Design a protein around this ligand. Structure first.
Ligand SMILES: *[C@@H]1O[C@H](CO)[C@@H](O[C@@H]2O[C@H](CO)[C@@H](O[C@@H]3O[C@H](CO)[C@@H](O)[C@H](O)[C@@H]3O)[C@H](O)[C@H]2NC(C)=O)[C@H](O)[C@H]1NC(C)=O
Ligand SMILES: *[C@@H]1O[C@H](CO)[C@@H](O[C@@H]2O[C@H](CO)[C@@H](O[C@H]3O[C@H](CO)[C@@H](O)[C@H](O)[C@@H]3O)[C@H](O)[C@H]2NC(C)=O)[C@H](O)[C@H]1NC(C)=O
Ligand SMILES: *[C@@H]1O[C@H](CO[C@@H]2O[C@@H](C)[C@@H](O)[C@@H](O)[C@@H]2O)[C@@H](O[C@@H]2O[C@H](CO)[C@@H](O)[C@H](O)[C@H]2NC(C)=O)[C@H](O)[C@H]1NC(C)=O
Ligand SMILES: *[C@@H]1O[C@H](CO)[C@@H](O[C@@H]2O[C@H](CO)[C@@H](O)[C@H](O)[C@H]2NC(C)=O)[C@H](O)[C@H]1NC(C)=O
Ligand SMILES: *[C@@H]1O[C@H](CO)[C@@H](O[C@@H]2O[C@H](CO)[C@@H](O)[C@H](O)[C@H]2NC(C)=O)[C@H](O)[C@H]1NC(C)=O
Ligand SMILES: *[C@@H]1O[C@H](CO)[C@@H](O[C@@H]2O[C@H](CO)[C@@H](O)[C@H](O)[C@H]2NC(C)=O)[C@H](O)[C@H]1NC(C)=O
Ligand SMILES: *[C@@H]1O[C@H](CO)[C@@H](O[C@@H]2O[C@H](CO)[C@@H](O)[C@H](O)[C@H]2NC(C)=O)[C@H](O)[C@H]1NC(C)=O
Ligand SMILES: CC(=O)N[C@@H]1[C@@H](O)[C@H](O)[C@@H](CO)O[C@H]1O
Ligand SMILES: *[C@@H]1O[C@H](CO)[C@@H](O)[C@H](O)[C@H]1NC(C)=O
Ligand SMILES: *[C@@H]1O[C@H](CO)[C@@H](O)[C@H](O)[C@H]1NC(C)=O
Ligand SMILES: *[C@@H]1O[C@H](CO)[C@@H](O)[C@H](O)[C@H]1NC(C)=O
Ligand SMILES: *[C@@H]1O[C@H](CO)[C@@H](O)[C@H](O)[C@H]1NC(C)=O
Lengths: 225, 433, 424, 197, 50
C-alpha cells in the first residue's frame, strides 16, 4: 500500500509520520513539491530539516525555522504569477546548512512520453538522513508503472537529530480556482530481508523480498533466484 | 505399481521365445576433492598474538590436519583400488572385427587431445563445477576459499591416467574375456566369448550363433540409446554432482564462519588488534579462537563421515569392477537388471560408470508342463531343461529360450517308476538306437 | 629416523616487503580546545553534543593531560587512537554531580540514566571527566545546573528532553503551577565549594564515535606514505590494516563506495583516499611445504615440494631456509614447485606420490628424480576372429590377505580425566 | 602387516594425544588443577577451573568421536573378514578376486593380533598356446557345437578341448550336439564328426 | 527382534538425553531462560544466556 496525494486551495499536504523512512517516486512537472520538512515539531521549536531540492540545487537547511499553517508560495503559475510569500516565514535559529551541486531535475515543462519518474528514498536513521535517488524514463502518466530499477545514493548527511514526523512543501483566490494537476506517492519502509542479485558490473539487477510469499521465502532460504 | 496376477497353475509354464540385450548404466562415486585446511591460517592468519593464544589449546588442530591428510590420502587409495585392477595396458587391435559388435562409442577416440571415449567425454561434460576451478587451471586455484588458508590438492592419477586404465580394462575384456582377470590375457573371438557368456546364464550357445546379427544389432542400439540419453537428460549424473555440491557447500560454510563475531567486538582480527590493547584484546581473540576452532572441528567431523561414505562407495565400485567387468556374475541385480553377460567401465569425474550388458527374456509363450514322463513304467526327467507341450505333442526345451526337441533317451534320465511322482504324464520317449 | 615417503611440514608464505599508509590529505586540527574550554558546559538534561569531522585529531595530548580525573576508553585503547580512523565523532559535554560519574558508564541505570542522559550497551568511545568546582561553583549555590527528575517514560539512549511539562506521578494532571502529585521536572543542583567530594560539579565530555562504516573523515596525525603495487606489503588504508598484494581493477565504485568486501567478510578491493582510484587486494602467496625423502638410512638428501604456488614466485619467506633457491633443477609440476629433484622423460612405476601423475624416486650418481608414473607395460593382445589361446599348464598360487577385525577396548573415567581427585 | 600395525598405531596415538591434552592451559593460569586450587580462592579459582574443564571435555569429545569413526571402519573391515571366512574358507567362491587373484580353489584362516590372515589358494593358467578355432563344425549339413569346451586346430586336424586346460580329443557325437544346418553360423568350418556307433 | 529394538531404544535414549540436557545450568544462575530474563538486566542476562 502506497498513499497517493493530490498536490494543489485543496492542499493535500498534511504532516505525515516518518515511520522508518519513506519512498517518494512521483510524476509531475515544475517540481511542485520541491521541498520537504522532517522533524518532531515543525514549528521552529526544533531544528526541523528543510530540504529544498529546487531547480538549482538541494539546499539542505536544518534550522529551527518557523513553518506557517500553510507555508506555500501560492503561485498560480500558467493559470507565472504569485499571491504571497510564506515558503520561508522566518528562521528563528539554526543548526546547520549545506549546499550541493547546482543540478536540475527534469521538472521543466514537458509531458510527451513522461520520463520524470524521479524515484527517491528518504531514510532517516542512526543520526543520518539519506537521499537515495534514481530517474526512470517511463511512458505512462497513470499510477506508478511496472519495472525494476535500483536507486543510487545521492547524499548522506550526519544530522544526528531525532525526527518523528515529516511534511512536504508546496509552492502552489478560492473562487474559480483550477486545482493543480499534480500528485505524488508516499511509500513506507519497514525492516525486511532482501536477496539482491549483484550482476557482473556490481549493479543490482533483481531482488527477492523474503517475506512477500512462500515462494520468495523459499528463494531466500535456498539463496537462489 | 501396476496390479498383476500371474497366471499360476499346477501344470502351466511360461517360456520366453525371444530375448533382448539391455545395456544399463550404473554411476558410483569413487573419490572426492582433496581439501587441506591450515589450522593457524584459518583460525587466525599471520597473527602472532592469536597464534600464541591458540598454542595454549594443545594439539587440537594437529589432529585436525592429520584427519584431513588421512582423508586426502584415502581418496587416492580409493581411485587406485577401483581403477588399477589391471597390471598391463592392453589395447585393441586396429581391426574392429568383433562379430558385428562395435565399441567405438566406448573405445578411446584418438582425435581428441584426451584419449577418452565418446561416452566418457559426455560424462565429463554433464558434470559441471559449482564454485570455481579445482582441473583445467593453468595458474593458481583462483577460488574464494583459497583466501583463508584452504587449499585443494590435485589427485595422484590424472584424468588421462584414469582413462588409460579404463581403456586397458575394456580392451582386455573385449579381446580376452575374463581370462585377463585371472592371469595372462588369452585371446578369443568375441562371438565365442559371447557364446561362453550365454552358456553362463543357462542358454545354449547355438542360440547366440544363430542370432548373432540380431544380438549385435540389439547391443549396438542399446549403446546408441545410452549415448542419446546422456546427451539429452541433465540429472543423469546427480550422484556424482551431489558429492561435489556437498563438499562445496561445506567449504563455503566453513569460510562464511569467519564472518561471525562469536561474541567479540568484531569478527575481523586485525580490527581487534588495531583498536584494543593486548590485555583486553586477548578476551576478544579468545572468543574468536573458540568459535573458529569449533567451526573447524565441525567441518573435519563432517568430512570424516563423508569420507567413510565415499570409501564404502569406492569399495563397492572396486567389487563391481572385479566381479562384473573382470568376470561374469551370478549375483542377482549386482550387475544390472537381467542375466548379467558383461560390463564395461567408463571413467567419470570422481567416479566410475558401469555399462552392464544383460540378457532379458522378451516374448513368453504359455505351455503345459509336467515334471516327468512315463514310457514303460519308468519315470524320465529332463537332463537340462523342462517338458512342454503345444497342446498335442511333448518336447524338451531349455528353460530360458523356447527350443523344443523330441524327448529321447539322450535328453532325459530314468529314475524309479510312475507311482511316486505327482503330475507325471504318459508319453513316448524315443530311443535313437 | 624417517621412512621413505613425502611428509607435510610448516606452511610457507611471503612476508610483506614494507608497510603502506594512505590517509586523507587534511591538516586542520579538530576543535578539541572549543569543547574543552567551553566557557559554560551545558546542563545534564541539556547536555550539548558537538560534532567533530573533516579534521585531524591528536588524542595523545588529551590523554597526556593530567587535569582529567577520569579517562576511560571502552571499545578502544587510548594509546591506539593515534592510529585509528573514524567516520564522525560526537563530543557530548555536560556537568553532573560527582556521584553520577558512575551512572555515566554503559549498561548503568538510574534517574540520570532514565530521565536525562542514557548511554548504549555497546558503547565504543572514551569518557573524560574533571572536577570544575572552582570554575563553576559559588558559595550561594550555582543553581544554573539542573537535571530532569520527573518523566512519564524512560528516555531512549542519547535522548535530550527540554520540555517543562509538569509530570504527575499520582495522576491528577496539573499544569503550570505545581500542586498535588505534580512538580517541576527539573531540579537544580547544590553546587557550592563547601560541598564535599561527589556533590561538587564535574565537567564531563564523552566521545562516542562510530567505527568503519562509512568514508572516514577525522583521524590521527600519522603521515601517509607512498603507494606501491604489485608486491606483498602491509597496507593501512584509513585505519583498515592488512597484508597482501595491490593491483588496479576495473570495478565501478559508487561516489560514496570505499571498500570492496569478500564473501568471508574480507576486503578484496579498496579505494585509495588520496587518489579516488580502485585498487585490488589479494593475499600474497602461501602454501604447504612437503619434504620428499627416501629412507633416511638409504640416504640423507631430500627434495621439497612447495604445493599450490607456481615456482616463479619462490625466487621472487616462512620456511626459514632459502638455500635451495639456487635452483638449476626447479621443476614446476601441476602440484607445485619441486626443488632438489631431476626431471626425466623416463616413466617408472610410482614410488613416492607427488600429485598430478608425478612421482619421485631415489635412483642412480645417486639422486632424486621426478617423473610421470607409468601405469604399466603396454601389451597388444593377439586378437583375431579365429584365434584362441588355451593354457597348456597351470600354477597353484597361495596369496595372503590381512584384515583388521578388532581394536583395543578402551574406557575412560569422566571425573578422573577431567577432575583428578578434585571436589571443586 | 601394515594394516594391523596401522590400527594399533592409530589407537596408541589417539590415547597419547588424549593424555597429552592434560598439559594445556586452555587459557587458564596453569594446566595443573591443584596449583590453581592452592594459588587462588574459590571465587577466582572457579574461572580457571571452568577453562580447564571446557578444554578437557572438548578433548574427550574429540577422542570419543574419532574412536566412533575408527570403530565404524573397523566394523566394516570385520564384516568383510566374516564374509571372507564364510565364502572363501567354508566354500568355493566364483566371485572374481574376492578370495585372491586367479580361480579360487580354497582358503585357510590364520589368527593375527587384532585381525585375520587368509591364505588363498588359487589356480592360475600358466603356459598358453595358440590355436585356430571355430564356433561350430559342419559335418553333413548339420552344425555341431561342443557340449563343453571349444574346437581347436593345430593346422591340419580339429579337436575339442575343455576351455581351460589344453587336452585335445576327437570330435564325436558324444562331445558335441547338433542344432540346425550350416547356413546360419558365422565362421563354421567343415570337418568330420566321428560317430562311435 | 533385539537388533531392531536396540535401534529404537538408542534413538529414544539419545533424544531423552538431549531433552534432559535442557536442565543443566552450564555455570549460569539457572537453567531457565525466562527466570534469567525476569531477574536480570540485559548486561548480565546476556552473560548468563551466553
Ligand atoms: C562347407 O561345406 C561345403 C563343403 O563341401 C562347401 O559349401 C558347398 O560346396 C559345394 C561344392 O562342394 C557347393 O555345391 C556347388 O554348387 C554350385 C552352384 O550350385 C554347383 O555348380 C556345383 O556343381 C556344386 O554343386 C555348395 O553350393 C556349397 N554350399 C552349400 C550350402 O552346400 C564349403 O566348403 C563350406 N560351406 C559352408 C556353407 O560351410
Ligand atoms: C607345467 O609347469 C610345471 C612347473 O610348475 C612343470 O614342472 C616342471 O617341469 C620341469 C621340466 O621337467 C622341471 O625342471 C626340471 O628339469 C629341468 C630340465 O632338466 C631342470 O633344468 C630343472 O632344474 C628341474 O630339474 C621342474 O622341476 C618342474 N617343476 C616342478 C614344480 O616339479 C611341468 O613340466 C609343466 N608341464 C608341462 C606339460 O609343460
Ligand atoms: C496360458 O494362460 C492362459 C490364461 O490366459 C492368459 O494367460 C497368460 C498367457 C496371460 O495372457 C494372462 O493374462 C491370461 O490369463 C490359460 O488358459 C487360457 O485362457 C484363455 C482365456 O483366459 C483362453 O482363451 C485360452 O483358450 C486358454 N488356453 C490357452 C491359452 O492355451 C492357458 O491354459 C495357459 N497355457 C497352458 C498351456 O496351460
Ligand atoms: C560403430 O558404431 C558407430 C555408432 O553406432 C558408427 O559411427 C557412425 O558412422 C557413420 C559413418 O559410418 C557416421 O556418419 C556417424 O556419424 C557415426 N556415428 C557414431 C555415433 O559413431 C560406426 O560406423 C560403427 N562402425 C562400424 C564398423 O559399423
Ligand atoms: C505340436 O508340435 C507337433 C510337432 O512339431 C505338431 O505336429 C506337426 O504339425 C505340422 C503342421 O501343423 C505337420 O506338418 C507335422 O507333420 C506334424 N508333426 C507330427 C509329428 O505330427 C503339432 O501340430 C503341434 N500342435 C499344435 C497344437 O500346434
Ligand atoms: C492340477 O489342478 C487341477 C485343478 O485346477 C486338478 O484337476 C483335477 O483333475 C482330476 C482329473 O485329472 C479331477 O478328477 C479333479 O476333480 C480335478 N480337480 C478339480 C478341483 O477340478 C489336477 O488334477 C491337478 N493336477 C496335478 C498333477 O496336481
Ligand atoms: C498311463 O499309462 C498307464 C499304463 O499304460 C495307465 O495305467 C493303466 O490304467 C488303466 C486304466 O485305469 C488300467 O486298466 C491299467 O491296469 C493300468 N496299467 C498300469 C500298468 O498301471 C495310466 O492310467 C496312464 N495314465 C493316464 C493319465 O491315462
Ligand atoms: C606456468 C606458469 O604459471 N607460469 C607463470 C608465468 O606465465 C607468469 O609470467 C609468472 C608471473 O610471475 O608466473 C608463473
Ligand atoms: C589528497 O591530495 C589530492 C591531490 O594532491 C587532493 O585532490 C585530495 O583532496 C587530497 N585528499 C583530501 C582528503 O582532500
Ligand atoms: C584551553 O586553552 C588553553 C590556552 O588557550 C590551552 O592551552 C588548553 O590546551 C585548552 N584546553 C584544551 C585544549 O583542552
Ligand atoms: C636402515 O639402515 C641401517 C644401516 O645404517 C640399518 O641398521 C637399519 O636396519 C635399516 N632400517 C631399515 C628399516 O631398513
Ligand atoms: C626429454 O627429451 C627432450 C628431447 O626430446 C629433451 O630436450 C629434454 O631435456 C628431455 N627431458 C629432460 C628432463 O631433460
Amino acid at each position: 500500500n502506497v498513499t497517493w496525494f493530490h498536490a494543489i486551495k485543496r492542499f493535500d499536504n498534511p504532516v505525515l509520520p516518518f515511520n522508518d523512512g519513506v519512498y517518494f517516486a512521483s510524476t509531475e512537472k515544475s517540481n511542485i513539491i520541491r521541498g520537504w520538512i522532517f522533524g518532531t515539531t515543525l514549528d521552529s521549536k526544533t531544528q526541523s530539516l528543510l530540504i529544498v531540492n529546487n531547480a538549482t540545487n538541494v539546499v539542505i537547511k536544518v534550522c529551527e525555522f518557523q513553518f506557517c499553517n500553510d507555508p506555500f508560495l501560492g503561485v498560480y503559475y500558467h493559470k507565472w504569477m504569485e499571491s504571497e510569500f510564506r515558503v520561508y516565514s522566518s528562521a528563528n535559529n539554526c543548526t546547520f546548512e549545506y549546499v550541493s551541486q547546482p543540478f536540475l531535475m527534469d521538472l521543466e515543462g514537458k509531458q510527451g512520453n513522461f520520463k520524470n519518474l524521479r524515484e527517491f528514498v528518504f531514510k532517516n536513521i542512526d543520526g543520518y538522513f539519506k537521499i537515495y535517488s534514481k530517474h526512470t524514463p517511463i511512458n505512462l502518466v497513470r499510477d506508478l508503472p511496472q519495472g525494476f530499477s535500483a536507486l543510487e545514493p545521492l547524499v548522506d548527511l550526519p544530522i544526528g537529530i531525532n525526527i518523528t514526523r515529516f511534511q512536504t512543501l508546496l509552492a502552489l483566490s478560492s473562487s474559480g480556482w483550477t486545482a493543480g494537476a499534480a500528485a505524488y506517492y508516499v511509500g513506507y519502509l519497514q525492516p525486511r530481508t532482501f536477496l539482491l542479485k549483484y550482476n557482473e558490473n556490481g549493479t543490482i539487477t533483481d531482488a527477492v523480498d523474503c517475506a512477500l510469499d512462500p515462494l520468495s521465502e523459499t528463494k531466500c532460504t535456498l539463496k537462489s533466484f | 505399481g501396476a496390479e498383476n496376477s500371474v497366471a499360476y497353475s499346477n501344470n502351466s509354464i511360461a517360456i520366453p521365445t525371444n530375448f533382448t540385450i539391455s545395456v544399463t548404466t550404473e554411476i558410483l562415486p569413487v573419490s572426492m576433492t582433496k581439501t587441506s585446511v591450515d589450522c593457524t591460517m584459518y583460525i587466525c592468519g599471520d597473527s602472532t598474538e592469536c597464534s600464541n593464544l591458540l598454542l595454549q589449546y594443545g594439539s587440537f588442530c594437529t589432529q585436525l590436519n592429520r584427519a584431513l591428510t588421512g582423508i586426502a590420502v584415502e581418496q587416492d587409495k580409493n581411485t587406485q583400488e577401483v581403477f588399477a585392477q589391471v597390471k598391463q595396458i592392453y589395447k585393441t587391435p586396429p581391426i574392429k572385427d568383433f562379430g558385428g559388435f562395435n565399441f567405438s562409442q566406448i573405445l578411446p577416440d584418438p582425435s581428441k587431445p584426451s584419449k577418452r571415449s565418446f561416452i566418457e567425454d559426455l560424462l565429463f561434460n554433464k558434470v559441471t563445477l559449482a564454485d570455481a576451478g579445482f582441473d583445467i587451471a593453468a595458474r593458481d586455484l583462483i577460488c574464494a576459499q583459497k583466501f583463508n588458508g584452504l587449499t585443494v590438492l590435485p589427485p595422484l592419477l590424472t584424468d588421462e591416467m584414469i582413462a588409460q586404465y579404463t581403456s586397458a580394462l575394456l580392451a582386455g575384456t573385449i579381446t580376452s574375456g575374463w581370462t585377463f582377470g585371472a592371469g595372462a590375457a588369452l585371446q578369443i573371438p568375441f562371438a565365442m566369448q559371447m557364446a561362453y557368456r550365454f552358456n553362463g546364464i543357462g542358454v545354449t550357445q547355438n542360440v547366440l550363433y544363430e542370432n548373432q546379427k540380431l544380438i549385435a544389432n540389439q547391443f549396438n542400439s542399446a549403446i546408441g540409446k545410452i549415448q542419446d540419453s546422456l546427451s539429452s537428460t541433465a540429472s543423469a549424473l546427480g550422484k556424482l554432482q551431489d558429492v561435489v555440491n556437498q563438499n562445496a557447500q561445506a567449504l563455503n560454510t566453513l569460510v562464511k564462519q569467519l564472518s561471525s563475531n562469536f561474541g567479540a567486538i568484531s569478527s575481523v582480527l586485525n580490527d581487534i588488534l588495531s583498536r584494543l590493547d593486548p590485555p583486553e584484546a586477548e578476551v576478544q581473540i579468545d572468543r574468536l579462537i573458540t568459535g573458529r576452532l569449533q567451526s573447524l572441528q565441525t567441518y573435519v567431523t563432517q568430512q570424516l563421515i563423508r569420507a567413510a561414505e565415499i570409501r564404502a562407495s569406492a569399495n563397492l565400485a572396486a567389487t563391481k569392477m572385479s566381479e562384473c567387468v573382470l568376470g561374469q556374475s551370478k549375483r542377482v541385480d549386482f550387475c544390472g537388471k537381467g542375466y548379467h553377460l558383461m560390463s564395461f567401465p567408463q571413467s567419470a569425474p570422481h567416479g566410475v560408470v558401469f555399462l552392464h550388458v544383460t540378457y532379458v527374456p522378451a516374448q513368453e509363450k504359455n505351455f503345459t508342463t509336467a515334471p516327468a514322463i512315463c514310457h514303460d513304467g519308468k519315470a524320465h526327467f529332463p537332463r537340462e531343461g523342462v517338458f512342454v507341450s503345444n497342446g498335442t505333442h511333448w518336447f524338451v526345451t531349455q528353460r530360458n529360450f523356447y527350443e523344443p526337441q523330441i524327448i529321447t533317451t539322450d535328453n532325459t534320465f530314468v529314475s524309479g517308476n510312475c507311482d511316486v511322482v505327482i503330475g507325471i504324464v504318459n508319453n513316448t520317449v524315443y530311443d535313437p538306437l | 629416523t624417517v621412512e621413505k615417503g613425502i611428509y607435510q611440514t610448516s606452511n610457507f608464505r611471503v612476508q610483506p616487503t614494507e608497510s603502506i599508509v594512505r590517509f586523507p590529505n587534511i591538516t586542520n586540527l579538530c576543535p578539541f580546545g572549543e569543547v574543552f574550554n567551553a566557557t559554560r558546559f551545558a546542563s545534564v538534561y541539556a547536555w550539548n553534543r558537538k560534532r567533530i569531522s573533516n579534521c585531524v585529531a591528536d588524542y595523545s595530548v588529551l590523554y597526556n593531560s593530567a587535569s582529567f580525573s577520569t579517562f576511560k576508553c571502552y571499545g578502544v585503547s587510548p594509546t591506539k587512537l593515534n592510529d585509528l580512523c573514524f567516520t564522525n565523532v560526537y563530543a557530548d559535554s555536560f556537568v553532573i554531580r560527582g556521584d553520577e560519574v558512575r551512572q555515566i558508564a554503559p549498561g548503568q541505570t538510574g534517574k540520570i540514566a532514565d530521565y536525562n542522559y542514557k548511554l548504549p550497551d555497546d558503547f565504543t568511545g572514551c569518557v573524560i571527566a574533571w572536577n570544575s568546582n572552582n570554575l563553576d561553583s559559588k558559595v550561594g549555590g550555582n543553581y544554573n545546573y539542573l537535571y530532569r527528575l520527573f518523566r512519564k517514560s524512560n528516555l531512549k539512549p542519547f535522548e535530550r528532553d527540554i520540555s517543562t511539562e509538569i509530570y504527575q506521578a499520582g495522576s491528577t494532571p496539573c499544569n503550570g503551577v505545581e500542586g498535588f502529585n505534580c512538580y517541576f521536572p527539573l531540579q537544580s543542583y547544590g553546587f557550592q565549594p563547601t560541598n564535599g567530594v561527589g556533590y561538587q560539579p564535574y565537567r564531563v565530555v564523552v566521545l562516542s564515535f562510530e567505527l568503519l562504516h562509512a568514508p572516514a573523515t577525522v583521524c590521527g596525525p600519522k603521515k601517509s606514505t607512498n603507494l606501491v603495487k604489485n608486491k606483498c606489503v602491509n597496507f593501512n588504508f584509513n585505519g583498515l590494516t592488512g597484508t597482501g598484494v595491490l593491483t588496479e581493477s576495473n570495478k565501478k565504485f559508487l561516489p560514496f563506495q570505499q571498500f570492496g568486501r569478500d564473501i568471508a567478510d574480507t576486503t578484496d578491493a579498496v579505494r585509495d583516499p588520496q587518489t579516488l582510484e580502485i585498487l585490488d587486494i589479494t593475499p600474497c602467496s602461501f602454501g604447504g611445504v612437503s619434504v620428499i625423502t627416501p629412507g633416511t638410512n638409504t640416504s640423507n638428501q631430500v627434495a621439497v615440494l612447495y604445493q599450490g604456488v607456481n615456482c616463479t614466485e619462490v625466487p621472487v619467506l616462512t620456511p626459514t631456509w632459502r638455500v635451495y633457491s639456487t635452483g638449476s633443477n626447479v621443476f614446476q609440476t601441476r602440484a607445485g614447485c619441486l626443488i632438489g629433484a631431476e626431471h626425466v622423460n623416463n616413466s617408472y612405476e610410482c614410488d613416492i606420490p607427488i600429485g598430478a601423475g608425478i612421482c619421485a624416486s631415489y635412483q642412480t650418481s645417486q639422486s632424486i628424480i621426478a617423473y610421470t608414473m607409468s601405469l604399466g607395460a603396454e601389451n597388444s593382445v593377439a586378437y583375431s576372429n579365429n584365434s584362441i589361446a588355451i593354457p597348456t599348464n597351470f600354477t597353484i598360487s597361495v596369496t595372503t590377505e590381512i584384515l583388521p577385525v578388532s581394536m583395543t577396548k578402551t574406557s575412560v573415567d569422566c571425573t578422573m580425566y577431567i577432575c583428578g581427585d578434585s571436589t571443586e
